[PDB]
Design a protein around this ligand. Structure first.
Ligand code: HEC
Ligand code: HEC
Ligand code: HEC
Ligand SMILES: C[C@H](CCC(=O)O)[C@H]1CC[C@H]2[C@@H]3CC[C@@H]4C[C@H](O)CC[C@]4(C)[C@H]3C[C@H](O)[C@]12C
Length: 71
């Protein structure tokens, strides 16, 4: 499958799967979540535990605006 880009108005956000599969061997951090996670994602989740928050706790991954968002 292909990577996906989230069309954030301030700048597209790329999600590179290969890096995550390698760096987050606990697959259940993202997969086999109960229903609702597709509908549930948004800016609140992205800037929280959905993206940025995991990067902050992991001590690795982009945490600055322009490291995720890029026109
Ligand atoms: C969130 C940070 C994830 C983690 C950690 C893992 N996966 Fe994932 N996976 C995630 C998304 C959002 C998607 C769809 C969009 C994309 O970029 O591909 C996927 C996709 C997969 C797939 C399909 C890949 C393909 O056919 O190319 C597989 C087989 C898959 N995910 C498995 C997988 C495993 C085994 C993981 C742990 C090692 C893992 N993923 C981590 C989100 C996230
Ligand atoms: C943990 C559960 C994570 C979640 C959820 C998301 N990310 Fe992540 N990401 C995580 C780690 C530990 C790393 C380091 C990987 C590395 O090898 O440096 C990353 C990395 C990224 C990157 C950069 C990858 C690279 O090639 O350097 C990007 C661009 C990124 N992450 C984006 C991103 C987005 C948009 C997410 C939400 C949709 C997201 N990540 C979730 C851990 C985790
Ligand atoms: C990745 C780890 C991010 C960092 C760091 C920042 N943002 Fe972000 N943001 C990210 C994603 C994946 C999304 C999209 C949510 C979705 O619905 O898919 C967003 C969203 C925004 C938005 C709203 C965009 C829109 O609704 O169209 C804004 C205005 C925004 N982000 C700005 C922003 C700023 C100023 C940041 C640094 C302070 C920042 N983001 C960090 C991913 C990530
Ligand atoms: C469920 C995990 C982990 C975050 C959490 O604990 O909620 C999150 C992390 C990344 C999230 C995906 C980001 C890309 C997509 C954003 C869409 O708008 C809704 C579906 C997708 C495919 C999201 C589904 C789900 O919301 C995921 C896989």
């Amino acid at each position: 499958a292909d990577d996906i880009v989230l069309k954030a108005k301030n700048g597209d956000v790329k999600f590179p799967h290969k890096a995550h599969q390698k760096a987050v061997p606990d697959c259940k951090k993202c997969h086999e979540k109960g229903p609702g996670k597709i509908e549930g994602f948004g800016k609140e989740m992205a800037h929280g535990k959905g993206c940025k928050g995991c990067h902050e706790e992991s001590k690795k991954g982009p945490t600055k605006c322009g490291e995720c968002h890029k026109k």
